[PDB]
């Protein structure tokens, strides 16, 4: 079945890529990097992120797999040594799909939308960052700090985690807002805690004075000018993973942070 493979582009990963394509040739898997059904990423979670964004308009039609040739990532949860086995099962099919939820960011000025697999962050360009925070059309706080991070479930082990966010199991359809260094006094008062929103809640940010912001989607950082609204909601689209064995998420969490 159609397939494509992306590489971190160092020596170790380019080699492993050519050996996989050859093994795929020993079945009749048609390489197509235009309409693949299976997208294999080789290197690190960053490489995987790029694989996801390279194909984010065909999400409902692709199964992604991560192979970490550096250290384990959360998306790249295959060692190189397991490559030949991968190719094998990947050919026979009879594999299962798991879907993780995604984050839609909408930026009104026209109107542009982004899909994040880790998180969408907002900071200020130059001046201090001051936005009013609106939850389902309800004014909640006036945030003054360094910025805000909206994380997916699988993104909570990433940036979110470093911001003191909670770690969330990916089957939960939600989004998590973490503060970045809010000032807090009788004047300026924010909630502090990470907030965790369900499906269909719209978290909307509204600027007070400066209208320019730096928006980051999975480490891509766009500068946006003359901003009127940023809207976060849990996306309707989901990413699909090819699952060949049990690698529970909490097991994955353990190996990356405890031992």
């Amino acid at each position: 079945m159609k397939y494509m493979i992306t590489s971190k582009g160092d020596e170790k990963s380019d080699l492993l890529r050519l050996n996989m394509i050859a093994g795929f040739g020993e079945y009749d898997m048609e390489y197509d990097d235009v309409e693949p059904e299976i997208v294999i990423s080789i290197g690190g979670d960053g490489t995987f992120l790029s694989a996801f964004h390279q194909y984010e308009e065909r999400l409902d039609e692709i199964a992604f797999i991560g192979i970490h040739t550096g250290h384990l990532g959360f998306y790249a949860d295959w060692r190189p040594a397991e490559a030949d086995k991968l190719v094998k099962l990947l050919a026979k099919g009879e594999y299962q799909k798991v879907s993780y939820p995604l984050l839609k960011t909408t930026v009104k000025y026209k109107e542009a939308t982004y899909l994040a697999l880790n998180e969408s962050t907002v900071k200020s360009s130059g001046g201090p960052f001051v936005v009013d925070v609106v939850i389902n059309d309800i004014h909640f706080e006036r945030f003054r700090g360094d910025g805000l991070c909206m994380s997916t479930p699988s993104g909570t082990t990433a940036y979110n985690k470093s911001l003191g966010g909670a770690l969330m199991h990916p089957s939960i359809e939600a989004m998590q807002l973490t503060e970045m260094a809010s000032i807090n006094n009788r004047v300026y008062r924010t909630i502090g805690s990470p907030l965790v929103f369900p499906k269909h809640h719209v978290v909307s940010l509204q600027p007070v004075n400066d209208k320019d912001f730096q928006i980051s989607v999975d480490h891509l950082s766009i500068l946006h000018r003359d901003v009127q609204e940023i809207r976060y909601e849990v996306s309707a689209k989901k990413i699909h993973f090819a699952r060949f064995r049990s690698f529970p998420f909490w097991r994955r969490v353990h190996d990356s942070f405890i031992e």
Copy 2:
């Protein structure tokens, strides 16, 4: 319809209780404190917690209402002044039910189960608190600290919040584990972050040496002796609230912590 009313027992709340019963008499609402269908709590969230536990084996059959005669609580979200209106709508019916998820704690030695509306905490009796933490039969960390807090969604604004937990919207069926003062070194290593578990995940705690613990369920604190396991999971039972108007949770969060 059958009903009962609980009081904080200070002067302000006992009065408001008698005036509500009289107004109920002006309809024909039968007071029954043995099999009520509607349980009204008057005072603070503590009073409400007690109302919930007084009737925790008939949860599937009761709608609770909170009236705060002190400061707003999260469960007691009615001012006294609105009492006469309450009685009124409470009589005609045609009100809606909202259900919040609950937490089951199971303590094996026989075996005892508890239902929490805020959270179930564990501390040590005397000695240091050391348990191994097991997630769906997966050894995750060996925790050494002051203790652990497992919070419901609606409990995340309570103890959980003070432990740096995330605030969670109550429609989300989950449970949140917050650490209490873990020691962290090359020897002892815990995750740090609040962890947030879905339905059907069982978080199980297993003692290393000392076997005695102080377990707290909604501020009730039992000492347990010769403990073999503590098991947390999202309960199948839910609590039901009578809803007469919109008081969104995030609105409720705003009023209690921001302004």
Copy 3:
């Protein structure tokens, strides 16, 4: 005695400035904004910061006073209403000096030094921020995160505080390092806690790959290119405040954050 007065430049503060100069004329206080002995700042702590930096090469020879025409600052701890009294005592002299410690930042490429009254921060320009941290020539950690904040004692109620830093009483001659969003895994491991250094300790930062950084001294933000070292130490210079009455620091802390 020679004196000068700086203004936030809104209407309220310019007026108060002219009325003070007139009152000074009713004594014979020579206005000199080139070699003042007394520097009065009118507006907010920001205005005061600017007053300090406008005269940072004559620190050993100036007493600063803050008047807050907005909300109380930590440096601007005089209400406008007290202005006429201020002028009065300011004329007779017989006032006491308090000195707060300062922070020297040294940036080697030539070599440039900065004096901070609040803090010196470092972030990355574009890429991720990765420096090795060296304490008295001892390699301590390899920090990978958003950045680092080195705060003075009186600066600990400022940025430092929002970064989870400790609040420090200003008579203590020290400097405090707070992390900004470190990544932590088996690979990358930082201390986490705020660190608090004494006099004569040199905290030195050393870049790993990217050599460009954004350095902030009291909210002035310079971009520095081809950086070889950043060195923090407690400065030998001190700032002097004119003290006319008791306004203890902890009292000051209480009014700004508790009530």
Copy 4:
């Protein structure tokens, strides 16, 4: 010179103790466990703490040494293998003393004082912990939470650290107050940050309703009844360490938490 040696009392440490005494016999060091001049502790920091408290009325007259037969402690910073060298230099003298500051806790009801090397903590007995906090006779906050920890400089790597306290270099004469799980709302408002006090500041705690508390001094936990005041200040007494080589504190910090 007079000397004594304390043991964790497991097999490894009792042996090492007898071999040191024999080596001391090969000089003429008089063993005296009543008036030693040198107190050697063998095991872990806990063992060392006990050695300190066993001799806390002769502090101005004893040099302590720690040997860790488990893992390195902060006070037990000698490996067993270095024992014979220790004995040697310990005999010739010509060693240097370093002194770390200590914490005095005063508990008025009569009046009892305690000396801590790590920290003095306060919790409640049964009920919720509510004290007013007074700094040099200035009412600062009304704390409602799980408790409070007052840490020495060298204690900041201990409990203090787990409470989010800052790590402090021991030459700094100060004390650090960390909160334990304060509730924070418009009603109850505490500072949050660790506070760091200098010499001569008296931090005094005053109970609101319940008067019983559990006070912990270096993990000794006394229950105190009918309490009127707890007073913390930096002690006039200091502990003295025998220093035979450079083991800088920050180096010590690195080895225990980073690598």
